[PDB]
Design a binder for this molecule. Structure first.
Ligand SMILES: NC(=O)c1ccc[n+]([C@@H]2O[C@H](COP(=O)([O-])OP(=O)(O)OC[C@H]3O[C@@H](n4cnc5c(N)ncnc54)[C@H](O)[C@@H]3O)[C@@H](O)[C@H]2O)c1
Ligand SMILES: NC(=O)c1ccc[n+]([C@@H]2O[C@H](COP(=O)([O-])OP(=O)(O)OC[C@H]3O[C@@H](n4cnc5c(N)ncnc54)[C@H](O)[C@@H]3O)[C@@H](O)[C@H]2O)c1
Ligand SMILES: O=C([O-])CC(=O)C(=O)O
Ligand SMILES: O=C([O-])CC(=O)C(=O)O
Lengths: 327, 327
C-alpha cells in the first residue's frame, strides 16, 4: 500500500543507527506498510558522509518495505510531504554549557525545524521529539507550527515508561508483557514520576504485591529516574538502542493503537490534571484511530501531586527560558 | 511455545548491539517463538560491565518474547543447552598483527569455543560464525566438535549476498525484493565471488538486462567485494547494523526456510563443485525443514572457476595455517 514518508533527524547519530533499520524493517508502522525515509543531518561533510555510510548499510539489508531513502542537509527539503517526523537530532550540552546555553541552542534548532514542518510537511503530520530536552523541544516546535494541530506535537516519555515497566517485572518476577496500567507523568528527566498505583498483573494490583511504599519512593522511582545515567556507567555510552525501541513503540502505538491498554505520551496539555495548556506533558493515554486520549479520573494523592508538582515546575522553568526565542 | 536458547558471543560489541534487540524482538526465529539469550564476553571487568549495561537496555525494551537472559564469561556455561549459537566475538587484528598472528589468535578462540559447544550445547545445535575470519573460524570450531554434525557449522556469507543484492537492484532500478537466484561463492573476503549469471527479476535475466560484463567484472564485483571498507570510509566505523541483519537472515532462513528461493551460506563442503570436503564455503543453497541443500548443476564457466579458484585457495591457505592448533 501507499508508502508513508518518514522524515528522521540526526540520522547519522547513535539512536538512529538502531532506529532506522527497524523502521525500514517495518517495526514502526506495520509489516504491510512501505516507507520512504527522508534523513536529516547537519550540513557538515563529516556528518553527511557518515549519513551516506548509514544509507549504504540500510540498503545492504535488502529491506522489502523501504520504498525510498534520501539524505538531506536542509529541514525544508527533509520535511517535504512527511507523514511522520522523528526529531532525534538535538544539540548536546557540551563543556561550559549552562542549562541556559542548552535551551537557547536547542530552541534555535526547533523553531527552524518547526517552521519547516509547518511549511512543507503533511497537513496532519505526526511529530515526535526524541532529542533532548524532549518536552520543551516539542513545545518550541509546536509553537513554531501554527498551521499544524498542536496535538500532533509529542515528546517521548516511552523510554521512562518501558524502564518502569522493566523494574516492576523484575521486582514482581512477573512477565513485563503482563503489566497493565503503568504510566509516567511529566518531564522526560530524572524529575519524571513513574506511577505504579494503578498497574495490574493478571488483574492483580502491582502496588499491593510489592506491598512496600519504601520500595516505591526509595528504589523504583530513583532507579527508573536515573536509569539513563546507569547505562552510561556500564556501557560508557548513552542508551541508543532502548531509546530507539521506545520511539518505535511511541509511533507504533500512536498509529496502530493500544487496543485499550494505557501508555505514556508527552503531549500538549489540554488542562487535564490541572496541567497548564500547551505544556508538553507525560500523561497516561490510550490510543486509537490514529489519535491519543488522556486517561481521566485518576486519583492524585498528596505524594503524587507533589511529584507532579516538581516535574511541571521544571517544565514551566524550561518554557520560561525558551519564550524569548518564540517571538 | 518452548523457547529456544540462543547463545551469542561478543555480546558487548557493535554487531551484537544491533543484533541482540532484533533477536529478542523475534526477527530471527519468528514472532511466536520465545528466546533465552545466553551472552558471552571476555572475562574482563570492562567487557562484562558493558555486557551488563546492554542487558539493562534489552530489558528496558520490554520484549515479550525474551523468556530469559544471562551474562557469561565462560563459553562452557554460555553454551549450556544452546539450540543456536552466533559466534560473533573474535580477536581483532591489532597493530603489528600479521595474517599469521590473526589466525593463531582466533584459532585459539574457536577450538576452545568449539570444544565447549561440543560438550554442553544441544546435540543438534545450529552454529553460525560471524567473527572474522568467519569461514576458517567455523572450520576450526567444527573440527573441534567431533560429537556434533559438521553441517551444523556455518559461516556468514549473507552480508556479501545482501550487498550484491543491493548493487543489482541499484543498477537495474528494480526492487531488491524481486531479485531471484543471486548468490556468492567462497570466502567472506574481498576475494568472494558474487555470481549474477543465474539471477532473475520477474523471470527476466538480470545479466541480460545490464547486458554489460565490464560492469560485472569492473564494478559489481569490486564494489560488493570492498563494500565493508567503503562503510569504514563513510562511517569511520565497521558495518555493525547490516552484518547484524545478515545474521538474522542467515539463521531465520536456515530455520524457517526460503520456500524455494536460493540464498548463500558458508557451509562445510561435501565435495560439490569440486570444493574439497570440510572446507567452509560460500555455496548457493535452498533451505527447508531446518536444513540447507546445495544448488547443483550450475554451469561454471572459465571466468567463474577462476574466481572460485582464488577464493578456495585463500581458504586452503587459512586452513593450512590453523592446522597446527587442531592437534
Ligand atoms: N528521548 C529520550 O528518552 C532520550 C534518551 C536518550 C538520549 N536522548 C537524546 O537523544 C538525542 C540524540 O542522541 P544520540 O545519542 O542519538 O546522539 P548523537 O550525537 O549520536 O546524534 C545526534 C545527531 O543529531 C545531529 N544533529 C545535530 N543538530 C542537528 C540539526 N540541527 N538538524 C539535524 N540533525 C542534527 C548530530 O550531527 C548527531 O549526529 C540527544 O539530545 C540525547 O540526549 C533522548
Ligand atoms: N561476518 C561478516 O560478514 C562480518 C562483517 C563485519 C565485521 N565482521 C567481524 O565481526 C566480528 C565482531 O565485530 P564487531 O564490530 O561487532 O566487534 P567489537 O570489537 O565491537 O566486538 C567484538 C566483541 O567480541 C568480544 N570477544 C573477544 N574475544 C571473545 C571471546 N574470546 N569470547 C567471547 N567474546 C569475545 C570482544 O570483547 C568484543 O566486545 C569481528 O571479527 C569483525 O571483523 C564480520
Ligand atoms: O533516558 C535517558 O538516557 C536519561 C533520562 O531521561 C534519565 O535517566 O532520566
Ligand atoms: O563485510 C565487511 O565489513 C568486510 C568484507 O568482507 C568486505 O568488504 O569484503
Amino acid at each position: 500500500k501507499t508508502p508513508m514518508r518518514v522524515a528522521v533527524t540526526g540520522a547519522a547519530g547513535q539512536i538512529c543507527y538502531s532506529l532506522l533499520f527497524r523502521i525500514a524493517n517495518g517495526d514502526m508502522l506495520g509489516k504491510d506498510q512501505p516507507v520512504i525515509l527522508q534523513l536529516l543531518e547537519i550540513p557538515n561533510e563529516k556528518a553527511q558522509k557518515a549519513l551516506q555510510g548509514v544509507m549504504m548499510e540500510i540498503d545492504d539489508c535488502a529491506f522489502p518495505l523501504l520504498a525510498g531513502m534520501t539524505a538531506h542537509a536542509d529541514p525544508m527539503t527533509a520535511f517535504k510531504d512527511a507523514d511522520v517526523a522523528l526529531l532525534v537530532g538535538a544539540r548536546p550540552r557540551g563543556p561550559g554549557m549552562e542549562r541556559k546555553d542548552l535551551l537557547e541552542a536547542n530552541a534555535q534548532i526547533f523553531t527552524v525545524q518547526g517552521k519547516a514542518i509547518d511549511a512543507v510537511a503533511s497537513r496532519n503530520i505526526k511529530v515526535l521529539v526524541v532529542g533532548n530536552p524532549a518536552n520543551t523541544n516539542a513545545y518550541i516546535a509546536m509553537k513554531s507550527a501554527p498551521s499544524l494541530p498542536a496535538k500532533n506535537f509529542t515528546a517521548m516519555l516511552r523510554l521512562d515508561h518501558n524502564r518502569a515497566l522493566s523494574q516492576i517485572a523484575a521486582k514482581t518476577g512477573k512477565p513485563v508483557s503482563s503489566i497493565e496500567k503503568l504510566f509516567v507523568w511529566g518531564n522526560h528527566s530524572p524529575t519524571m514520576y513513574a506511577d505504579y498505583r494503578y498497574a495490574q498483573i493478571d488483574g492483580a494490583s502491582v502496588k499491593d504485591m510489592i506491598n512496600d511504599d519504601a520500595w516505591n519512593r526509595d528504589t523504583f522511582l530513583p532507579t527508573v529516574g536515573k536509569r539513563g545515567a546507569a547505562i552510561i556507567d556500564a556501557r560508557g555510552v548513552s542508551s541508543a538502542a532502548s531509546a530507539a525501541n521506545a520511539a518505535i513503540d511511541h509511533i507504533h502505538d500512536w498509529v496502530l493503537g493500544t487496543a485499550g491498554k494505557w501508555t505514556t505520551m508527552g503531549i500538549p496539555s489540554d488542562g487535564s490534571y490541572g496541567i497548564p495548556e500547551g505544556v508538553i506533558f507525560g500523561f497516561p493515554v490510550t490510543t486509537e484511530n490514529g489519535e491519543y486520549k488522556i486517561v481521566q479520573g485518576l486519583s492524585i494523592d498528596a505524594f503524587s501531586q507533589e511529584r507532579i508538582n516538581v516535574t511541571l515546575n521544571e517544565l514551566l522553568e524550561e518554557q520560561n527560558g525558551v519564550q524569548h526565542l518564540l517571538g
